[PDB]
From Swiss-Prot:
Originating gene: folK
Catalytic reaction equation(s): 6-hydroxymethyl-7,8-dihydropterin + ATP = (7,8-dihydropterin-6-yl)methyl diphosphate + AMP + H(+)
Matches recorded under NCBIfam families: folK, PRK10239.1
Entries under Pfam families matching the protein: HPPK (PF01288)
Alphabetical UniProt keywords: ATP-binding, Folate biosynthesis, Kinase, Nucleotide-binding, Transferase
GO MF, one annotated term: ATP binding
Thermal properties of activity per the entry: Thermostable. Retains 75% of its activity after heating 30 minutes at 96 degrees Celsius.
Biological process per Gene Ontology, one example term: tetrahydrofolate biosynthetic process
Native organism: Escherichia coli (strain K12)
Gene3D superfamilies: 7,8-Dihydro-6-hydroxymethylpterin-pyrophosphokinase HPPK
UniProt EC number: 2.7.6.3
Broad enzyme group: transferase
Chain's role: Catalyzes the transfer of pyrophosphate from adenosine triphosphate (ATP) to 6-hydroxymethyl-7,8-dihydropterin, an enzymatic step in folate biosynthesis pathway.
Protein name: 2-amino-4-hydroxy-6-hydroxymethyldihydropteridine pyrophosphokinase
Domain of life, per lineage: Bacteria
Length: 158
């Protein structure tokens, strides 16, 4: 199998925060680094001030349970996905959501393979477009079919 995971960090370090999930995504048991797009850099929020939204795509070979695979990444996000700051570490900056899970669909109260928030974003589809520009979503949708229908502004590489 193979689950398309994403990577989002709210830090401004040389892949110092992404490196944590990068190796952890491949550290997920029953899987192993199969593919990983490049790191992007979407502009801020506009009115306020959002950091370098480093959005990347991944293609792990996780044969685990969509819920466990979710707990795994989520575990790395909270376990080894937090910034350090003296004796008072920071919040969770490491992000890793299962954009997809091979060719299946859940959409349950606990699961949601067809990343309910990937077919409506302009910073989560591009990364996947760098490894699966023609990703045929489980339900049938196409990553390209969404980028062409919305024409989301491309993002620069971090």
């Amino acid at each position: 199998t193979v689950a398309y995971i994403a990577i989002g960090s709210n830090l401004a370090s040389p892949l110092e925060q992404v490196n944590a999930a990068l190796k952890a995504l491949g550290d997920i048991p029953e899987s192993h680094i199969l593919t990983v797009s490049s790191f992007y850099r979407t502009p801020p929020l506009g009115p306020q001030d959002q950091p370098d939204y480093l959005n990347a795509a991944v293609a792990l070979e996780t044969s685990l349970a969509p819920e466990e695979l979710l707990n795994h990444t989520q575990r790395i996000e909270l376990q080894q996905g937090r910034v350090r700051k003296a004796e008072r570490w920071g919040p969770r900056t490491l992000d890793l959501d299962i954009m997809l899970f091979g060719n299946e669909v859940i959409n349950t109260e606990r699961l949601t393979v067809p990343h309910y928030d990937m077919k409506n974003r302009g910073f989560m589809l591009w990364p996947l477009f760098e490894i699966a520009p023609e990703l045929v979503f489980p339900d049938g949708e196409m990553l390209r079919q969404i980028l062409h229908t919305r024409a989301f502004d491309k993002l620069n590489k971090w």
